[PDB]
CSV table of C-alpha atoms and ligand atoms in Angstrom, one decimal:
chain,number,residue,atom,x,y,z
Z,1,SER,CA,-53.8,-123.1,12.6
Z,2,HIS,CA,-53.4,-123.4,16.4
Z,3,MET,CA,-56.6,-123.4,18.6
Z,4,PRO,CA,-56.4,-123.2,22.4
Z,5,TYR,CA,-59.6,-125.2,23.0
Z,6,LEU,CA,-60.0,-128.8,22.1
Z,7,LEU,CA,-63.0,-131.2,22.4
Z,8,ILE,CA,-62.4,-134.9,22.3
Z,9,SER,CA,-64.9,-137.7,22.7
Z,10,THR,CA,-65.5,-141.5,22.7
Z,11,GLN,CA,-68.6,-143.6,23.1
Z,12,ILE,CA,-68.7,-146.2,25.9
Z,13,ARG,CA,-66.6,-148.3,26.4
Z,14,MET,CA,-64.1,-145.6,27.6
Z,15,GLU,CA,-61.2,-148.1,27.4
Z,16,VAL,CA,-61.4,-148.5,23.6
Z,17,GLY,CA,-61.4,-146.2,20.6
Z,18,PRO,CA,-62.2,-144.6,18.3
Z,19,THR,CA,-61.7,-141.2,19.9
Z,20,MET,CA,-63.0,-138.1,18.0
Z,21,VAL,CA,-60.2,-135.6,18.2
Z,22,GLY,CA,-61.2,-132.8,15.8
Z,23,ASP,CA,-63.6,-131.0,13.5
Z,24,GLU,CA,-63.0,-129.6,10.0
Z,25,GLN,CA,-61.4,-126.4,11.4
Z,26,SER,CA,-58.9,-128.3,13.7
Z,27,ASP,CA,-55.1,-127.7,13.6
Z,28,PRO,CA,-54.0,-130.2,10.8
Z,29,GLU,CA,-50.5,-130.5,12.2
Z,30,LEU,CA,-51.9,-131.4,15.6
Z,31,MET,CA,-54.3,-134.0,14.0
Z,32,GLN,CA,-51.3,-135.5,12.1
Z,33,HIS,CA,-49.3,-135.6,15.4
Z,34,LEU,CA,-52.1,-137.6,17.0
Z,35,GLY,CA,-52.1,-140.1,14.0
Z,36,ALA,CA,-55.7,-139.0,13.2
Z,37,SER,CA,-57.6,-139.9,10.0
Z,38,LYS,CA,-60.2,-137.7,8.4
Z,39,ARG,CA,-63.6,-138.9,7.4
Z,40,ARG,CA,-67.1,-137.7,6.7
Z,41,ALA,CA,-69.8,-139.6,8.5
Z,42,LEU,CA,-73.0,-140.6,6.7
Z,43,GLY,CA,-75.4,-137.6,6.6
Z,44,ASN,CA,-72.7,-135.0,7.7
Z,45,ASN,CA,-71.5,-132.2,5.5
Z,46,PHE,CA,-68.4,-131.8,7.6
Z,47,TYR,CA,-65.2,-133.9,8.1
Z,48,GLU,CA,-64.2,-135.2,11.5
Z,49,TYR,CA,-60.8,-136.3,12.8
Z,50,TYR,CA,-60.5,-139.5,14.7
Z,51,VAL,CA,-57.9,-142.0,16.1
Z,52,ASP,CA,-58.2,-145.7,16.9
Z,53,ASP,CA,-56.6,-145.0,20.4
Z,54,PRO,CA,-58.7,-144.9,23.6
Z,55,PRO,CA,-59.1,-141.4,25.2
Z,56,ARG,CA,-56.5,-142.0,28.0
Z,57,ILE,CA,-53.8,-142.3,25.2
Z,58,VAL,CA,-55.0,-139.2,23.5
Z,59,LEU,CA,-55.1,-137.2,26.8
Z,60,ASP,CA,-51.4,-138.2,27.5
Z,61,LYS,CA,-50.4,-137.1,24.0
Z,62,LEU,CA,-52.3,-133.8,24.4
Z,63,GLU,CA,-50.7,-133.2,27.8
Z,64,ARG,CA,-47.2,-133.3,26.1
Z,65,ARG,CA,-48.6,-130.6,23.7
Z,66,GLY,CA,-49.5,-128.2,26.5
Z,67,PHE,CA,-53.2,-129.1,26.8
Z,68,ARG,CA,-55.0,-129.6,30.2
Z,69,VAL,CA,-58.4,-131.2,30.8
Z,70,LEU,CA,-60.7,-128.5,32.2
Z,71,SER,CA,-63.8,-130.6,32.2
Z,72,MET,CA,-65.2,-134.1,31.3
Z,73,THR,CA,-68.9,-134.9,30.8
Z,74,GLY,CA,-71.3,-137.6,29.6
Z,75,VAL,CA,-74.1,-137.0,27.1
Z,76,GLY,CA,-76.1,-139.9,25.5
Z,77,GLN,CA,-73.6,-142.7,25.4
Z,78,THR,CA,-70.6,-140.4,24.8
Z,79,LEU,CA,-67.9,-139.1,27.1
Z,80,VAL,CA,-66.5,-135.7,26.1
Z,81,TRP,CA,-63.3,-133.9,27.4
Z,82,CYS,CA,-62.8,-130.2,27.0
Z,83,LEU,CA,-59.1,-129.2,27.0
Z,84,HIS,CA,-57.3,-125.9,27.0
Z,85,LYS,CA,-53.7,-125.0,26.0
Z,86,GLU,CA,-52.1,-123.9,29.3
E,4,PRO,CA,-68.9,-112.3,35.1
E,5,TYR,CA,-70.7,-115.7,34.2
E,6,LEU,CA,-71.6,-117.0,30.8
E,7,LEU,CA,-73.6,-120.1,29.7
E,8,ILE,CA,-73.2,-121.5,26.2
E,9,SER,CA,-74.7,-124.7,24.7
E,10,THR,CA,-75.0,-126.9,21.6
E,11,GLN,CA,-76.8,-130.1,20.9
E,12,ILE,CA,-74.8,-133.1,19.7
E,13,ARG,CA,-72.9,-133.3,17.4
E,14,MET,CA,-70.4,-131.1,19.5
E,15,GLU,CA,-68.4,-130.3,16.3
E,16,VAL,CA,-71.2,-128.3,14.6
E,17,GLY,CA,-73.3,-125.3,15.5
E,18,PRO,CA,-75.6,-123.6,16.2
E,19,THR,CA,-74.3,-122.6,19.6
E,20,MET,CA,-76.6,-120.7,22.1
E,21,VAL,CA,-74.5,-117.9,23.5
E,22,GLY,CA,-77.0,-115.8,25.5
E,23,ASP,CA,-80.3,-115.0,27.1
E,24,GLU,CA,-82.4,-111.7,26.6
E,25,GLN,CA,-80.3,-109.8,29.3
E,26,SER,CA,-76.9,-110.7,27.8
E,27,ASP,CA,-74.3,-107.8,27.2
E,28,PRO,CA,-75.2,-106.6,23.6
E,29,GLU,CA,-71.6,-105.6,22.9
E,30,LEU,CA,-70.2,-109.1,23.7
E,31,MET,CA,-73.1,-110.7,21.6
E,32,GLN,CA,-72.1,-108.4,18.7
E,33,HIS,CA,-68.5,-109.3,19.1
E,34,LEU,CA,-69.4,-113.0,18.8
E,35,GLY,CA,-71.4,-112.2,15.6
E,36,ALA,CA,-74.6,-113.5,17.3
E,37,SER,CA,-78.1,-113.2,15.9
E,38,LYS,CA,-81.2,-112.7,18.1
E,39,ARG,CA,-84.3,-114.9,17.7
E,40,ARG,CA,-87.4,-116.0,19.5
E,41,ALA,CA,-87.9,-119.8,19.3
E,42,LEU,CA,-91.4,-121.1,18.7
E,43,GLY,CA,-93.4,-121.1,22.0
E,44,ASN,CA,-90.9,-118.9,23.9
E,45,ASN,CA,-91.6,-115.3,24.9
E,46,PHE,CA,-87.9,-114.5,25.3
E,47,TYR,CA,-85.1,-113.9,22.8
E,48,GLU,CA,-82.0,-116.0,22.6
E,49,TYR,CA,-78.6,-115.2,21.1
E,50,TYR,CA,-77.0,-117.8,18.9
E,51,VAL,CA,-74.2,-118.2,16.3
E,52,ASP,CA,-73.8,-120.7,13.5
E,53,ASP,CA,-70.2,-121.6,14.8
E,54,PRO,CA,-69.5,-124.8,16.7
E,55,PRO,CA,-68.8,-124.3,20.5
E,56,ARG,CA,-65.0,-124.7,20.1
E,57,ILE,CA,-64.9,-121.6,18.0
E,58,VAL,CA,-67.0,-119.7,20.5
E,59,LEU,CA,-64.8,-120.8,23.4
E,60,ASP,CA,-61.7,-119.5,21.6
E,61,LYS,CA,-63.4,-116.1,21.0
E,62,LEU,CA,-64.5,-115.9,24.7
E,63,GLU,CA,-61.0,-116.8,25.9
E,64,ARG,CA,-59.7,-113.7,24.0
E,65,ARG,CA,-62.3,-111.7,26.0
E,66,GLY,CA,-61.0,-112.9,29.4
E,67,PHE,CA,-63.4,-115.8,29.9
E,68,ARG,CA,-62.4,-119.3,31.1
E,69,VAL,CA,-64.4,-122.6,31.1
E,70,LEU,CA,-65.1,-123.6,34.7
E,71,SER,CA,-67.3,-126.6,33.8
E,72,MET,CA,-68.9,-128.5,31.0
E,73,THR,CA,-71.9,-130.8,31.3
E,74,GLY,CA,-74.5,-132.8,29.4
E,75,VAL,CA,-78.3,-132.7,29.9
E,76,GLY,CA,-80.7,-134.4,27.5
E,77,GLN,CA,-78.8,-134.2,24.2
E,78,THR,CA,-77.3,-130.8,25.0
E,79,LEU,CA,-73.7,-129.9,26.0
E,80,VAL,CA,-73.5,-126.8,28.3
E,81,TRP,CA,-70.3,-124.8,29.2
E,82,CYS,CA,-70.2,-122.5,32.2
E,83,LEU,CA,-67.6,-119.7,31.8
E,84,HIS,CA,-66.2,-117.1,34.2
E,85,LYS,CA,-64.5,-113.8,33.4
E,86,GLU,CA,-61.2,-113.9,35.4
V,4,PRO,CA,-70.1,-122.0,52.8
V,5,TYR,CA,-71.8,-124.3,50.2
V,6,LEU,CA,-74.8,-123.5,47.9
V,7,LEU,CA,-76.8,-125.6,45.4
V,8,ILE,CA,-78.9,-123.9,42.8
V,9,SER,CA,-80.8,-125.4,39.8
V,10,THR,CA,-83.0,-124.8,36.8
V,11,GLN,CA,-84.7,-127.1,34.3
V,12,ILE,CA,-84.0,-126.6,30.6
V,13,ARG,CA,-84.1,-124.1,29.0
V,14,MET,CA,-81.1,-122.8,30.9
V,15,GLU,CA,-81.8,-119.2,29.7
V,16,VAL,CA,-85.1,-118.9,31.6
V,17,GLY,CA,-86.2,-119.2,35.2
V,18,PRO,CA,-87.4,-120.2,37.7
V,19,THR,CA,-84.2,-121.0,39.5
V,20,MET,CA,-84.3,-123.1,42.8
V,21,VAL,CA,-82.0,-121.3,45.2
V,22,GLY,CA,-82.6,-123.1,48.5
V,23,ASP,CA,-84.0,-125.7,50.8
V,24,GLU,CA,-86.1,-125.2,54.0
V,25,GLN,CA,-82.9,-124.7,56.1
V,26,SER,CA,-81.3,-122.1,53.8
V,27,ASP,CA,-79.9,-118.8,55.1
V,28,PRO,CA,-83.0,-116.5,55.3
V,29,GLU,CA,-81.0,-113.4,54.8
V,30,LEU,CA,-79.3,-114.7,51.6
V,31,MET,CA,-82.7,-115.9,50.3
V,32,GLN,CA,-84.1,-112.4,50.9
V,33,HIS,CA,-81.1,-110.8,49.2
V,34,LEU,CA,-81.8,-112.9,46.1
V,35,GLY,CA,-85.5,-111.8,46.1
V,36,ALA,CA,-86.5,-115.4,46.6
V,37,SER,CA,-90.0,-116.6,47.4
V,38,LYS,CA,-91.1,-119.8,49.2
V,39,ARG,CA,-93.3,-122.4,47.6
V,40,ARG,CA,-94.1,-126.1,48.2
V,41,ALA,CA,-94.4,-128.7,45.5
V,42,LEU,CA,-97.6,-130.7,45.7
V,43,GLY,CA,-96.1,-134.0,47.1
V,44,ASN,CA,-93.4,-132.3,49.3
V,45,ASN,CA,-93.7,-131.7,53.0
V,46,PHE,CA,-90.8,-129.1,52.8
V,47,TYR,CA,-90.6,-125.6,51.4
V,48,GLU,CA,-88.2,-124.6,48.7
V,49,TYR,CA,-86.8,-121.1,47.8
V,50,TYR,CA,-87.0,-119.9,44.2
V,51,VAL,CA,-86.5,-116.8,42.0
V,52,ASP,CA,-88.0,-116.0,38.6
V,53,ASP,CA,-84.5,-115.1,37.3
V,54,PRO,CA,-82.5,-117.4,35.0
V,55,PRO,CA,-79.4,-119.0,36.6
V,56,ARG,CA,-76.9,-116.7,35.0
V,57,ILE,CA,-78.4,-113.8,36.9
V,58,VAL,CA,-78.4,-115.7,40.2
V,59,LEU,CA,-74.7,-116.7,39.6
V,60,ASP,CA,-73.8,-113.0,39.2
V,61,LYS,CA,-75.6,-112.1,42.4
V,62,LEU,CA,-73.9,-114.9,44.3
V,63,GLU,CA,-70.4,-113.8,43.0
V,64,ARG,CA,-71.1,-110.4,44.7
V,65,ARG,CA,-71.7,-112.3,48.0
V,66,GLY,CA,-68.3,-114.1,47.6
V,67,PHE,CA,-69.5,-117.4,46.1
V,68,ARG,CA,-67.7,-119.2,43.2
V,69,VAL,CA,-69.0,-122.0,41.0
V,70,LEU,CA,-67.0,-125.2,41.8
V,71,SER,CA,-69.1,-127.5,39.6
V,72,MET,CA,-72.1,-127.7,37.2
V,73,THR,CA,-73.9,-130.9,36.2
V,74,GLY,CA,-77.0,-132.2,34.5
V,75,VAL,CA,-79.5,-134.8,36.0
V,76,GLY,CA,-82.8,-135.6,34.4
V,77,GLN,CA,-83.8,-132.3,32.7
V,78,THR,CA,-82.2,-130.2,35.4
V,79,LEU,CA,-78.9,-128.2,35.5
V,80,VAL,CA,-77.4,-127.9,39.0
V,81,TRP,CA,-74.6,-125.6,40.1
V,82,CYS,CA,-72.5,-126.1,43.3
V,83,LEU,CA,-71.0,-122.9,44.7
V,84,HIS,CA,-68.6,-122.3,47.6
V,85,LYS,CA,-67.9,-119.1,49.5
V,86,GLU,CA,-64.3,-118.2,48.9
X,4,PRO,CA,-50.1,-138.7,33.2
X,5,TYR,CA,-54.0,-138.9,32.9
X,6,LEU,CA,-56.1,-141.8,34.2
X,7,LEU,CA,-59.7,-142.8,33.8
X,8,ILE,CA,-61.4,-145.1,36.3
X,9,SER,CA,-65.1,-146.1,36.5
X,10,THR,CA,-67.8,-148.0,38.3
X,11,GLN,CA,-71.4,-148.6,37.7
X,12,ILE,CA,-74.0,-147.7,40.3
X,13,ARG,CA,-73.9,-148.4,43.3
X,14,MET,CA,-70.9,-146.1,43.8
X,15,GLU,CA,-70.1,-147.8,47.2
X,16,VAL,CA,-69.2,-151.2,45.7
X,17,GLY,CA,-66.9,-152.5,43.1
X,18,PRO,CA,-65.7,-153.6,40.6
X,19,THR,CA,-63.8,-150.5,39.6
X,20,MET,CA,-62.4,-150.4,36.0
X,21,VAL,CA,-58.9,-149.0,36.4
X,22,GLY,CA,-57.2,-149.4,33.0
X,23,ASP,CA,-57.2,-150.3,29.3
X,24,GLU,CA,-54.9,-152.8,27.5
X,25,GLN,CA,-52.0,-150.2,27.3
X,26,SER,CA,-52.2,-149.1,30.9
X,27,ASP,CA,-49.0,-148.7,33.0
X,28,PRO,CA,-48.4,-152.3,34.4
X,29,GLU,CA,-46.6,-151.0,37.5
X,30,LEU,CA,-49.6,-148.8,38.4
X,31,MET,CA,-52.0,-151.7,37.7
X,32,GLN,CA,-49.9,-153.9,40.0
X,33,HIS,CA,-49.9,-151.2,42.7
X,34,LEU,CA,-53.7,-151.1,42.6
X,35,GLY,CA,-53.9,-154.9,42.9
X,36,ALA,CA,-55.7,-155.1,39.6
X,37,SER,CA,-56.5,-158.2,37.6
X,38,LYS,CA,-56.6,-158.3,33.7
X,39,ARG,CA,-59.5,-159.8,31.8
X,40,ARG,CA,-61.3,-159.7,28.4
X,41,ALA,CA,-65.1,-159.2,28.8
X,42,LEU,CA,-67.4,-161.3,26.5
X,43,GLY,CA,-67.6,-159.7,23.1
X,44,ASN,CA,-64.6,-157.4,23.6
X,45,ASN,CA,-61.3,-157.8,21.6
X,46,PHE,CA,-59.4,-155.7,24.3
X,47,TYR,CA,-58.3,-156.5,27.9
X,48,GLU,CA,-59.3,-154.3,30.8
X,49,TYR,CA,-57.8,-153.9,34.3
X,50,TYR,CA,-60.2,-154.0,37.2
X,51,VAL,CA,-60.2,-154.3,41.0
X,52,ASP,CA,-62.9,-155.5,43.4
X,53,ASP,CA,-62.6,-152.4,45.5
X,54,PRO,CA,-65.1,-149.5,45.3
X,55,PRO,CA,-63.8,-146.3,43.6
X,56,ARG,CA,-63.2,-144.4,46.9
X,57,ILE,CA,-60.5,-147.0,47.8
X,58,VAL,CA,-59.0,-146.7,44.3
X,59,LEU,CA,-59.0,-142.8,44.5
X,60,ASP,CA,-57.1,-143.0,47.8
X,61,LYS,CA,-54.4,-145.3,46.3
X,62,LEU,CA,-54.0,-143.0,43.3
X,63,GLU,CA,-53.7,-140.0,45.6
X,64,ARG,CA,-50.6,-141.7,47.1
X,65,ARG,CA,-49.1,-141.8,43.5
X,66,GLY,CA,-49.6,-138.0,43.0
X,67,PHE,CA,-52.9,-138.2,41.1
X,68,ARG,CA,-55.8,-135.7,41.7
X,69,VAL,CA,-59.4,-135.9,40.5
X,70,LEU,CA,-60.0,-133.2,37.9
X,71,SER,CA,-63.5,-134.3,36.9
X,72,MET,CA,-66.2,-136.9,37.7
X,73,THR,CA,-69.2,-137.6,35.4
X,74,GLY,CA,-72.1,-140.0,34.7
X,75,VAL,CA,-72.9,-141.7,31.4
X,76,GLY,CA,-75.5,-144.4,31.2
X,77,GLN,CA,-75.4,-146.0,34.7
X,78,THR,CA,-71.5,-145.5,35.0
X,79,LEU,CA,-69.6,-143.0,37.1
X,80,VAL,CA,-66.2,-142.0,35.5
X,81,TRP,CA,-63.4,-140.2,37.2
X,82,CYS,CA,-60.6,-138.4,35.3
X,83,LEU,CA,-57.4,-138.0,37.3
X,84,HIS,CA,-54.2,-136.1,36.5
X,85,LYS,CA,-50.8,-136.5,38.0
X,86,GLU,CA,-50.2,-133.2,39.7
P,1,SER,CA,-59.1,-142.5,59.9
P,2,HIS,CA,-57.4,-140.8,57.0
P,3,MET,CA,-60.0,-140.4,54.2
P,4,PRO,CA,-58.3,-138.4,51.4
P,5,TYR,CA,-61.5,-138.8,49.1
P,6,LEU,CA,-65.2,-138.9,50.0
P,7,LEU,CA,-68.2,-139.6,47.8
P,8,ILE,CA,-71.6,-138.4,48.9
P,9,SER,CA,-74.9,-138.7,47.1
P,10,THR,CA,-78.6,-138.0,47.1
P,11,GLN,CA,-81.4,-138.7,44.7
P,12,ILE,CA,-83.5,-135.8,43.3
P,13,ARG,CA,-84.9,-133.6,44.9
P,14,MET,CA,-81.5,-132.2,45.8
P,15,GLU,CA,-83.1,-130.1,48.6
P,16,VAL,CA,-84.1,-133.1,50.7
P,17,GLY,CA,-82.3,-136.1,52.2
P,18,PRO,CA,-81.4,-138.9,52.8
P,19,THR,CA,-77.8,-138.3,51.8
P,20,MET,CA,-75.5,-141.3,51.4
P,21,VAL,CA,-72.2,-140.3,53.2
P,22,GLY,CA,-70.2,-143.5,53.3
P,23,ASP,CA,-69.5,-147.1,52.5
P,24,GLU,CA,-68.5,-149.9,55.0
P,25,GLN,CA,-64.8,-148.9,55.0
P,26,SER,CA,-65.5,-145.2,55.8
P,27,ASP,CA,-64.0,-143.7,59.0
P,28,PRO,CA,-66.5,-144.4,61.8
P,29,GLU,CA,-65.5,-141.1,63.6
P,30,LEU,CA,-66.3,-138.9,60.6
P,31,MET,CA,-69.6,-140.9,60.1
P,32,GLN,CA,-70.4,-140.3,63.8
P,33,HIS,CA,-69.5,-136.6,63.4
P,34,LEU,CA,-72.1,-136.3,60.6
P,35,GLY,CA,-74.8,-138.0,62.7
P,36,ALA,CA,-74.9,-140.9,60.3
P,37,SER,CA,-76.6,-144.3,60.7
P,38,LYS,CA,-76.1,-147.6,58.9
P,39,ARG,CA,-78.7,-149.0,56.5
P,40,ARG,CA,-78.8,-151.9,54.1
P,41,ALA,CA,-80.7,-151.6,50.8
P,42,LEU,CA,-82.6,-154.9,50.0
P,43,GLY,CA,-80.4,-155.8,46.9
P,44,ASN,CA,-77.0,-155.1,48.5
P,45,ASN,CA,-75.1,-157.4,50.9
P,46,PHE,CA,-73.2,-154.3,52.2
P,47,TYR,CA,-74.4,-151.4,54.5
P,48,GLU,CA,-74.1,-147.7,53.7
P,49,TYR,CA,-73.8,-144.7,56.0
P,50,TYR,CA,-76.6,-142.1,55.6
P,51,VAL,CA,-78.0,-139.0,57.1
P,52,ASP,CA,-81.5,-137.5,56.9
P,53,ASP,CA,-80.0,-134.1,56.0
P,54,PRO,CA,-80.0,-132.7,52.5
P,55,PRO,CA,-76.5,-132.6,50.8
P,56,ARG,CA,-76.0,-128.8,51.3
P,57,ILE,CA,-75.9,-129.4,55.1
P,58,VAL,CA,-73.5,-132.3,54.7
P,59,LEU,CA,-71.2,-130.3,52.4
P,60,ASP,CA,-71.0,-127.5,55.1
P,61,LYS,CA,-70.2,-130.1,57.8
P,62,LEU,CA,-67.4,-131.6,55.6
P,63,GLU,CA,-66.0,-128.1,54.8
P,64,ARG,CA,-65.4,-127.6,58.6
P,65,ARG,CA,-63.5,-131.0,58.5
P,66,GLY,CA,-61.1,-129.8,55.8
P,67,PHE,CA,-62.9,-131.3,52.7
P,68,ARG,CA,-63.5,-129.5,49.4
P,69,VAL,CA,-65.8,-130.4,46.5
P,70,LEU,CA,-63.7,-131.3,43.5
P,71,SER,CA,-66.6,-132.4,41.3
P,72,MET,CA,-70.3,-133.0,41.2
P,73,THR,CA,-72.2,-135.1,38.7
P,74,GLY,CA,-75.6,-136.6,37.9
P,75,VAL,CA,-76.1,-140.3,37.0
P,76,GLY,CA,-79.6,-141.8,36.6
P,77,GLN,CA,-81.6,-139.7,39.2
P,78,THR,CA,-78.7,-139.4,41.6
P,79,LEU,CA,-76.4,-136.4,42.3
P,80,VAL,CA,-72.9,-137.3,43.5
P,81,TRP,CA,-70.3,-135.1,45.0
P,82,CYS,CA,-66.6,-136.0,45.1
P,83,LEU,CA,-64.7,-134.3,47.9
P,84,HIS,CA,-61.0,-134.3,48.8
P,85,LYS,CA,-59.3,-133.5,52.1
P,86,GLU,CA,-57.4,-130.3,51.4
M,101,K,K1,-64.9,-145.8,23.4
M,102,K,K1,-73.9,-129.1,18.0
M,103,K,K1,-84.7,-123.0,33.2
M,104,K,K1,-70.2,-149.8,41.6
M,105,K,K1,-82.6,-135.9,47.8
């Protein structure tokens, strides 16, 4: 179902994918719209959604869906974007 | 009016820290938070098993908005404001 | 009009650095801040025992708003502006 | 209408990375960017020799505004939005 | 003279200078207004503008000149502020 907050991420380089676009409880229709695939990384008990696109492409698709970036941060070697439906 | 929440990577999974000892008990109860004292700390912390995206959606319904998100060590922190 | 405050992890516990040597003495007194000097520093700093969420709430009452929050090393820093 | 640009420290000197392989060729041309494939990468990147402050000013003239700036590794990244 | 964006920085501690306030192409009048001087770090072939003031002092001076902080970030042991003339 619809969720107003989204978290997306990519590891450096920022210009290339994959971009993580969702967790197990993400909107399946939105994940399908992004062209995302579902997988379970080694050691995780949860599925994650990801796309081969770089984050700029994902951000533009999310903008057309009504999402806006509220914040971006780095942690480890990962860039994370926090978006909100507004 | 201000809230600080956090999770360690992975961002898609909990636990999420949702409060310090002086947090509003009613808001903590609304989030379904548990209270615990980590080893070595003399203060209680409120936490939930939910990932941060779930907590952010619950706080949005309570009038909070994310002002900023940052990384420190291996932790992601969100600063929210009631407005 | 600008303020910089900080705390080291854990974010839920103090001390919180609330000023440099040239900070507004009246605002530092209002926050209940004390002066201290780190061993290798030739300057005084203002600090409170409160965690940063408590300081942020006191600063909102004085007309300050968080514009940005970031991590550096093991420190969380907030940049506030009086609006 | 989002953009991501970056530079490694020092922030006062280029090169500034201004685009990925699928970036708007007109905007890349407006920035005076060159296209190259770094050693070991299968993708092309757009870059300029200018420091990021110069790039930010050029993007401002095309209606872009910085929403966020962050550090990761030894890289500074800016996220801009056409607004 | 028109500087839509500014980048300033200091290394920790944030309560003490020097604060880097410009690159070689910065407006000399704004640099003079801040009381900035030029310096060259050993490894750089370019000069930078700096002040002995901590960043809070610089932010207040820039606020009086029409600048507003849009973002602040840490990278390595440096704090950087991105300001926009608005
Ligand atoms: K990437
Ligand atoms: K987590
Ligand atoms: K602390
Ligand atoms: K650079
Ligand atoms: K400093």
